[PDB]
Amino acid sequence: RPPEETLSLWKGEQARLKARVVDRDTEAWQRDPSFSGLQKVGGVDVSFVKGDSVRACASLVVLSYPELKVVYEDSRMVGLKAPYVSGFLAFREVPFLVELVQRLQEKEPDLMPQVVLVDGNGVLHQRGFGVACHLGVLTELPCIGVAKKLLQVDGLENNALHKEKIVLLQAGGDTFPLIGSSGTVLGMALRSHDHSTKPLYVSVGHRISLEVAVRLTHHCCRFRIPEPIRQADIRSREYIRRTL
Ligand SMILES: [Mn+2]
Ligand SMILES: [Mn+2]
């Protein structure tokens, strides 16, 4: 676990970049009732090795929309430089994802995604600047944060009341808002699939509104996990498994 000097630097870096986050729609396809004009959706993930604190595999996929077929994949082995500390996930993962986006620009610039689904939160975060905001600000791409568990910040808890609301979600697309103690909506719990009970936690990363982000996340869900994140997850784990 890092020294305080490193944590301060990281908090200071998060506060500096937070000023560049845009939490409204800035792309024409976002204001369209069926997202007409959206053709390419990105997904990123990093997989790790059970006995290894140094090596990891980072993946970027691009999928066509709305067919959700993989049209681009880049999976590469990387050397970790920071351990996992909750609230500082970007400093473990985002440097490698930025490089993957730069590599896409050099190899297949016409397949640059119009929005990236990130495994982890955006503005639903201890300091309002999670890994999905961090990636968005560093690449300037629109980003959505999709987390598989609830980050307990600003009075949010996975308590008895919270689980009552999860029971109330009955079908894919059903949602309920995640309200901070300041009264502000930090994200949405989303039941992504008809045949899944555990919701997703969706928040704004960059250059997108929450309502658009929730609706797009739902439209990418063949299973519980949205297909761009699901394919990056499957492919980066396969790469590690085959070289292990
Ligand atoms: Mn991940
Ligand atoms: Mn994963």
Side-chain angles (χ1 to χ4, degrees), residues 1-49 51-210 212-244:
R1 171 179 194 99
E4 184 199 303
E5 185 180 335
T6 306
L7 299 185
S8 297
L9 224 93
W10 290 356
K11 290 173 189 159
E13 191 63 14
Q14 291 178 329
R16 181 175 75 78
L17 299 177
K18 185 167 155 59
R20 292 160 88 111
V21 170
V22 180
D23 62 346
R24 41 186 177 80
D25 301 303
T26 70
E27 320 289 320
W29 59 264
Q30 296 174 337
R31 319 266 186 169
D32 194 276
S34 54
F35 299 135
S36 294
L38 183 58
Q39 303 275 320
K40 292 164 299 168
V41 174
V44 291
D45 198 26
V46 186
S47 295
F48 301 79
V49 198
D52 205 299
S53 56
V54 168
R55 281 179 38 240
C57 179
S59 287
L60 161 64
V61 300
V62 188
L63 282 54
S64 58
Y65 186 87
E67 301 83 5
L68 302 179
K69 292 310 172 189
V70 168
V71 301
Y72 177 84
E73 179 201 343
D74 188 17
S75 295
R76 77 185 299 236
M77 293 293 314
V78 294
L80 301 161
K81 302 182 193 67
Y84 171 70
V85 185
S86 183
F88 298 104
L89 179 59
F91 300 91
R92 178 167 176 82
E93 301 193 342
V94 80
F96 310 108
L97 302 179
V98 165
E99 288 169 1
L100 292 178
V101 169
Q102 295 167 342
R103 289 225 290 187
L104 177 53
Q105 173 60 28
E106 293 166 3
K107 291 186 299 178
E108 291 272 0
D110 290 339
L111 296 182
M112 186 60 59
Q114 292 160 281
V115 59
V116 182
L117 296 210
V118 181
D119 185 39
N121 298 285
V123 306
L124 163 52
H125 179 265
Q126 289 90 331
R127 291 163 289 281
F129 192 77
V131 66
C133 303
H134 207 131
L135 184 62
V137 166
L138 288 186
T139 68
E140 278 295 344
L141 300 169
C143 287
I144 297 169
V146 188
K148 306 182 292 291
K149 307 171 165 181
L150 175 72
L151 184 52
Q152 298 199 171
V153 52
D154 202 12
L156 301 178
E157 292 179 84
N158 183 22
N159 53 18
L161 165 68
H162 184 82
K163 288 198 189 60
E164 290 176 18
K165 301 189 207 179
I166 290 172
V167 170
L168 295 184
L169 311 167
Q170 307 284 38
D174 288 343
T175 54
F176 67 86
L178 303 170
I179 322 295
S181 301
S182 55
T184 56
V185 178
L186 305 169
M188 298 282 181
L190 161 74
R191 172 141 171 175
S192 58
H193 201 235
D194 280 352
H195 302 292
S196 181
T197 53
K198 255 193 170 138
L200 300 175
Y201 298 95
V202 180
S203 58
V204 163
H206 184 52
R207 282 185 185 287
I208 190 164
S209 67
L210 180 55
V212 165
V214 173
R215 189 159 117 258
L216 180 58
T217 298
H218 176 51
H219 278 84
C220 294
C221 279
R222 292 181 186 176
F223 303 101
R224 171 176 181 247
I225 300 305
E227 197 63 13
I229 292 167
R230 181 179 168 261
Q231 289 300 326
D233 176 73
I234 290 177
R235 285 163 149 88
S236 60
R237 278 190 292 96
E238 178 204 356
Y239 187 0
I240 279 176
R241 180 184 45 94
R242 295 177 77 183
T243 67
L244 155 166

mmCIF file of all heavy atoms in Angstrom, residues 177-204:
data_model
loop_
_atom_site.group_PDB
_atom_site.id
_atom_site.type_symbol
_atom_site.label_atom_id
_atom_site.label_comp_id
_atom_site.label_asym_id
_atom_site.label_seq_id
_atom_site.Cartn_x
_atom_site.Cartn_y
_atom_site.Cartn_z
ATOM 1 N N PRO A 177 -32.627 5.437 -8.829
ATOM 2 C CA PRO A 177 -31.502 6.370 -8.719
ATOM 3 C C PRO A 177 -30.678 6.187 -7.455
ATOM 4 O O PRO A 177 -31.174 5.762 -6.408
ATOM 5 C CB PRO A 177 -32.190 7.738 -8.722
ATOM 6 C CG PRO A 177 -33.557 7.467 -8.170
ATOM 7 C CD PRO A 177 -33.928 6.099 -8.626
ATOM 8 N N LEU A 178 -29.382 6.518 -7.575
ATOM 9 C CA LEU A 178 -28.452 6.491 -6.449
ATOM 10 C C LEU A 178 -28.256 7.923 -5.957
ATOM 11 O O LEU A 178 -27.551 8.716 -6.593
ATOM 12 C CB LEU A 178 -27.125 5.851 -6.850
ATOM 13 C CG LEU A 178 -27.249 4.436 -7.417
ATOM 14 C CD1 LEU A 178 -25.917 3.981 -8.013
ATOM 15 C CD2 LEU A 178 -27.773 3.445 -6.365
ATOM 16 N N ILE A 179 -28.863 8.247 -4.819
ATOM 17 C CA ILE A 179 -28.933 9.617 -4.329
ATOM 18 C C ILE A 179 -27.905 9.809 -3.231
ATOM 19 O O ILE A 179 -27.870 9.042 -2.261
ATOM 20 C CB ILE A 179 -30.336 9.957 -3.807
ATOM 21 C CG1 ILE A 179 -31.400 9.309 -4.684
ATOM 22 C CG2 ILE A 179 -30.524 11.465 -3.787
ATOM 23 C CD1 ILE A 179 -31.417 9.853 -6.072
ATOM 24 N N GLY A 180 -27.086 10.845 -3.371
ATOM 25 C CA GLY A 180 -26.198 11.226 -2.296
ATOM 26 C C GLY A 180 -26.937 11.915 -1.165
ATOM 27 O O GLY A 180 -28.088 12.332 -1.292
ATOM 28 N N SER A 181 -26.258 12.012 -0.019
ATOM 29 C CA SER A 181 -26.830 12.721 1.119
ATOM 30 C C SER A 181 -26.994 14.212 0.850
ATOM 31 O O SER A 181 -27.776 14.870 1.545
ATOM 32 C CB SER A 181 -25.973 12.493 2.361
ATOM 33 O OG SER A 181 -25.901 11.110 2.662
ATOM 34 N N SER A 182 -26.277 14.758 -0.134
ATOM 35 C CA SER A 182 -26.492 16.132 -0.578
ATOM 36 C C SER A 182 -27.725 16.263 -1.465
ATOM 37 O O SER A 182 -28.022 17.369 -1.931
ATOM 38 C CB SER A 182 -25.260 16.657 -1.325
ATOM 39 O OG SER A 182 -24.906 15.810 -2.407
ATOM 40 N N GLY A 183 -28.431 15.160 -1.720
ATOM 41 C CA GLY A 183 -29.595 15.143 -2.580
ATOM 42 C C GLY A 183 -29.307 14.958 -4.054
ATOM 43 O O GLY A 183 -30.251 14.962 -4.854
ATOM 44 N N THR A 184 -28.051 14.756 -4.438
ATOM 45 C CA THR A 184 -27.674 14.703 -5.842
ATOM 46 C C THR A 184 -27.660 13.262 -6.344
ATOM 47 O O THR A 184 -27.324 12.327 -5.612
ATOM 48 C CB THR A 184 -26.307 15.357 -6.060
ATOM 49 O OG1 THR A 184 -25.329 14.729 -5.220
ATOM 50 C CG2 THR A 184 -26.370 16.839 -5.721
ATOM 51 N N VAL A 185 -28.037 13.095 -7.610
ATOM 52 C CA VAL A 185 -28.050 11.781 -8.251
ATOM 53 C C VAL A 185 -26.656 11.465 -8.792
ATOM 54 O O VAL A 185 -26.178 12.103 -9.731
ATOM 55 C CB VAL A 185 -29.104 11.714 -9.361
ATOM 56 C CG1 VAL A 185 -29.074 10.358 -10.039
ATOM 57 C CG2 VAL A 185 -30.494 11.995 -8.787
ATOM 58 N N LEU A 186 -26.003 10.470 -8.195
ATOM 59 C CA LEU A 186 -24.650 10.065 -8.565
ATOM 60 C C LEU A 186 -24.628 9.014 -9.669
ATOM 61 O O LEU A 186 -23.639 8.916 -10.407
ATOM 62 C CB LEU A 186 -23.922 9.523 -7.333
ATOM 63 C CG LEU A 186 -23.911 10.509 -6.168
ATOM 64 C CD1 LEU A 186 -23.433 9.853 -4.876
ATOM 65 C CD2 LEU A 186 -23.026 11.684 -6.538
ATOM 66 N N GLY A 187 -25.693 8.232 -9.794
ATOM 67 C CA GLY A 187 -25.734 7.168 -10.775
ATOM 68 C C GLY A 187 -27.083 6.490 -10.743
ATOM 69 O O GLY A 187 -28.033 6.988 -10.134
ATOM 70 N N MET A 188 -27.168 5.364 -11.448
ATOM 71 C CA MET A 188 -28.384 4.561 -11.504
ATOM 72 C C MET A 188 -28.053 3.100 -11.286
ATOM 73 O O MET A 188 -27.101 2.578 -11.870
ATOM 74 C CB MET A 188 -29.104 4.661 -12.852
ATOM 75 C CG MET A 188 -29.575 6.022 -13.217
ATOM 76 S SD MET A 188 -31.085 6.461 -12.354
ATOM 77 C CE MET A 188 -31.329 8.100 -13.056
ATOM 78 N N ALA A 189 -28.877 2.431 -10.485
ATOM 79 C CA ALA A 189 -28.887 0.977 -10.482
ATOM 80 C C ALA A 189 -29.748 0.499 -11.643
ATOM 81 O O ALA A 189 -30.884 0.941 -11.801
ATOM 82 C CB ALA A 189 -29.421 0.444 -9.156
ATOM 83 N N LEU A 190 -29.218 -0.420 -12.437
ATOM 84 C CA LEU A 190 -29.881 -0.865 -13.651
ATOM 85 C C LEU A 190 -29.937 -2.382 -13.690
ATOM 86 O O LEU A 190 -28.904 -3.054 -13.572
ATOM 87 C CB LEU A 190 -29.153 -0.341 -14.898
ATOM 88 C CG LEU A 190 -29.448 -1.073 -16.212
ATOM 89 C CD1 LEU A 190 -30.836 -0.747 -16.782
ATOM 90 C CD2 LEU A 190 -28.353 -0.804 -17.242
ATOM 91 N N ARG A 191 -31.142 -2.916 -13.861
ATOM 92 C CA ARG A 191 -31.314 -4.334 -14.138
ATOM 93 C C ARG A 191 -31.106 -4.555 -15.630
ATOM 94 O O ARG A 191 -31.980 -4.229 -16.434
ATOM 95 C CB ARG A 191 -32.697 -4.803 -13.700
ATOM 96 C CG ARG A 191 -32.983 -6.206 -14.138
ATOM 97 C CD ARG A 191 -33.728 -6.967 -13.084
ATOM 98 N NE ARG A 191 -34.170 -8.236 -13.632
ATOM 99 C CZ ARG A 191 -34.774 -9.179 -12.930
ATOM 100 N NH1 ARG A 191 -35.006 -8.997 -11.637
ATOM 101 N NH2 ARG A 191 -35.138 -10.300 -13.530
ATOM 102 N N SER A 192 -29.963 -5.132 -16.003
ATOM 103 C CA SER A 192 -29.555 -5.099 -17.404
ATOM 104 C C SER A 192 -30.218 -6.175 -18.250
ATOM 105 O O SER A 192 -30.277 -6.037 -19.479
ATOM 106 C CB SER A 192 -28.036 -5.237 -17.510
ATOM 107 O OG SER A 192 -27.579 -6.434 -16.900
ATOM 108 N N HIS A 193 -30.721 -7.233 -17.627
ATOM 109 C CA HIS A 193 -31.196 -8.401 -18.348
ATOM 110 C C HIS A 193 -32.486 -8.878 -17.698
ATOM 111 O O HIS A 193 -32.715 -8.645 -16.507
ATOM 112 C CB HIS A 193 -30.119 -9.496 -18.330
ATOM 113 C CG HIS A 193 -30.263 -10.514 -19.411
ATOM 114 N ND1 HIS A 193 -30.334 -11.866 -19.149
ATOM 115 C CD2 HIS A 193 -30.328 -10.386 -20.757
ATOM 116 C CE1 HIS A 193 -30.455 -12.525 -20.287
ATOM 117 N NE2 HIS A 193 -30.454 -11.651 -21.277
ATOM 118 N N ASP A 194 -33.337 -9.536 -18.490
ATOM 119 C CA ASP A 194 -34.547 -10.116 -17.917
ATOM 120 C C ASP A 194 -34.203 -11.219 -16.928
ATOM 121 O O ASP A 194 -34.853 -11.361 -15.887
ATOM 122 C CB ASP A 194 -35.452 -10.691 -19.010
ATOM 123 C CG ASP A 194 -36.277 -9.635 -19.721
ATOM 124 O OD1 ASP A 194 -36.272 -8.458 -19.290
ATOM 125 O OD2 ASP A 194 -36.965 -10.007 -20.701
ATOM 126 N N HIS A 195 -33.172 -12.002 -17.234
ATOM 127 C CA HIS A 195 -32.866 -13.209 -16.487
ATOM 128 C C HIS A 195 -31.672 -13.023 -15.554
ATOM 129 O O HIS A 195 -30.988 -13.989 -15.210
ATOM 130 C CB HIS A 195 -32.661 -14.358 -17.470
ATOM 131 C CG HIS A 195 -33.855 -14.600 -18.345
ATOM 132 N ND1 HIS A 195 -35.053 -15.077 -17.854
ATOM 133 C CD2 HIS A 195 -34.044 -14.410 -19.672
ATOM 134 C CE1 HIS A 195 -35.925 -15.178 -18.844
ATOM 135 N NE2 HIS A 195 -35.338 -14.779 -19.957
ATOM 136 N N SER A 196 -31.447 -11.789 -15.109
ATOM 137 C CA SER A 196 -30.412 -11.437 -14.152
ATOM 138 C C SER A 196 -31.040 -10.625 -13.026
ATOM 139 O O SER A 196 -31.895 -9.772 -13.271
ATOM 140 C CB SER A 196 -29.299 -10.632 -14.830
ATOM 141 O OG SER A 196 -28.278 -10.311 -13.905
ATOM 142 N N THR A 197 -30.636 -10.897 -11.789
ATOM 143 C CA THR A 197 -31.187 -10.181 -10.645
ATOM 144 C C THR A 197 -30.240 -9.133 -10.075
ATOM 145 O O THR A 197 -30.708 -8.141 -9.507
ATOM 146 C CB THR A 197 -31.583 -11.163 -9.533
ATOM 147 O OG1 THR A 197 -30.474 -12.022 -9.222
ATOM 148 C CG2 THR A 197 -32.805 -12.000 -9.939
ATOM 149 N N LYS A 198 -28.932 -9.323 -10.213
ATOM 150 C CA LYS A 198 -27.973 -8.397 -9.636
ATOM 151 C C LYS A 198 -27.771 -7.209 -10.569
ATOM 152 O O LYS A 198 -27.297 -7.394 -11.694
ATOM 153 C CB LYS A 198 -26.649 -9.089 -9.375
ATOM 154 C CG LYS A 198 -26.437 -9.387 -7.912
ATOM 155 C CD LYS A 198 -25.003 -9.792 -7.609
ATOM 156 C CE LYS A 198 -24.767 -9.850 -6.100
ATOM 157 N NZ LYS A 198 -23.956 -11.040 -5.714
ATOM 158 N N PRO A 199 -28.097 -5.991 -10.146
ATOM 159 C CA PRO A 199 -28.064 -4.846 -11.062
ATOM 160 C C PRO A 199 -26.646 -4.382 -11.370
ATOM 161 O O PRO A 199 -25.671 -4.755 -10.712
ATOM 162 C CB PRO A 199 -28.829 -3.773 -10.287
ATOM 163 C CG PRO A 199 -28.550 -4.098 -8.861
ATOM 164 C CD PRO A 199 -28.517 -5.604 -8.787
ATOM 165 N N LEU A 200 -26.545 -3.546 -12.410
ATOM 166 C CA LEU A 200 -25.357 -2.748 -12.697
ATOM 167 C C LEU A 200 -25.492 -1.369 -12.062
ATOM 168 O O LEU A 200 -26.597 -0.858 -11.861
ATOM 169 C CB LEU A 200 -25.144 -2.582 -14.206
ATOM 170 C CG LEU A 200 -24.945 -3.838 -15.047
ATOM 171 C CD1 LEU A 200 -24.873 -3.508 -16.531
ATOM 172 C CD2 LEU A 200 -23.691 -4.535 -14.614
ATOM 173 N N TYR A 201 -24.354 -0.759 -11.766
ATOM 174 C CA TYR A 201 -24.310 0.595 -11.224
ATOM 175 C C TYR A 201 -23.651 1.479 -12.274
ATOM 176 O O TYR A 201 -22.453 1.348 -12.543
ATOM 177 C CB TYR A 201 -23.582 0.612 -9.885
ATOM 178 C CG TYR A 201 -24.285 -0.249 -8.834
ATOM 179 C CD1 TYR A 201 -23.897 -1.563 -8.602
ATOM 180 C CD2 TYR A 201 -25.366 0.245 -8.110
ATOM 181 C CE1 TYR A 201 -24.556 -2.359 -7.642
ATOM 182 C CE2 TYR A 201 -26.019 -0.530 -7.169
ATOM 183 C CZ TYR A 201 -25.610 -1.827 -6.939
ATOM 184 O OH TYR A 201 -26.276 -2.580 -6.004
ATOM 185 N N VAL A 202 -24.455 2.335 -12.902
ATOM 186 C CA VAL A 202 -24.054 3.126 -14.054
ATOM 187 C C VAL A 202 -23.901 4.579 -13.629
ATOM 188 O O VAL A 202 -24.797 5.146 -12.989
ATOM 189 C CB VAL A 202 -25.075 2.988 -15.193
ATOM 190 C CG1 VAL A 202 -24.644 3.831 -16.402
ATOM 191 C CG2 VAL A 202 -25.210 1.527 -15.583
ATOM 192 N N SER A 203 -22.781 5.192 -14.008
ATOM 193 C CA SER A 203 -22.574 6.605 -13.748
ATOM 194 C C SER A 203 -21.881 7.271 -14.939
ATOM 195 O O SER A 203 -21.267 6.615 -15.789
ATOM 196 C CB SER A 203 -21.776 6.804 -12.455
ATOM 197 O OG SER A 203 -20.527 6.141 -12.523
ATOM 198 N N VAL A 204 -21.981 8.602 -14.987
ATOM 199 C CA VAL A 204 -21.381 9.359 -16.084
ATOM 200 C C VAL A 204 -19.863 9.332 -15.958
ATOM 201 O O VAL A 204 -19.313 9.541 -14.870
ATOM 202 C CB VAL A 204 -21.910 10.798 -16.097
ATOM 203 C CG1 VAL A 204 -20.989 11.706 -16.947
ATOM 204 C CG2 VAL A 204 -23.323 10.805 -16.625
#
